[PDB]
Ligand binder design. Structure first.
Ligand SMILES: NCCCCCCNS(=O)(=O)c1cccc2c(Cl)cccc12
Ligand SMILES: [Ca+2]
Lengths: 89, 17
């Protein structure tokens, strides 16, 4: 019954939705798990233009990770991120 | 996505094509 975020994900365009994977793939170059383990995440800050410690990267996951796995996978990245997008509207 | 979506531009450099 979490359709309020699931329905929102459909609002994503094909360009957005398809490219959603594109950047995700940078983190999971050889990740069998299919998730970002903060170690790979440090690249995420670099994209912006920052290279803070992996532990510091983990905090970014910790704050952002609603499930509390300490990791961010494609599904969490895809749906969890929509948690921010929904923002009571 | 969450914001402006820096990830769309994030690729910056690439190989293979
Ligand atoms: N830096 C936060 C504010 C801007 C957010 C949009 C631009 N940056 S981003 O969307 O690539 C991004 C930023 C910080 C943590 C992330 C995690 Cl844990 C997973 C996937 C993407 C993430
Ligand atoms: Ca998680």
């Amino acid at each position: 019954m979490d359709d309020i975020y699931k329905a929102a994900v459909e609002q994503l365009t094909e360009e957005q939705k398809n490219e959603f994977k594109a950047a995700f793939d940078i983190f999971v170059l050889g990740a069998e798990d299919g998730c970002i383990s903060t170690k790979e995440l440090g690249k995420v800050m670099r994209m912006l233009g920052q290279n803070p410690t992996p532990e510091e990267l983990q905090e970014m996951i910790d704050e952002v990770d609603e499930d509390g796995s300490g990791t961010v996978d494609f599904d969490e990245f895809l749906v969890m991120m929509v948690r921010c997008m929904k923002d009571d509207s | 996505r969450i914001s402006a979506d820096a990830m769309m531009q994030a690729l910056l450099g690439a190989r293979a094509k």
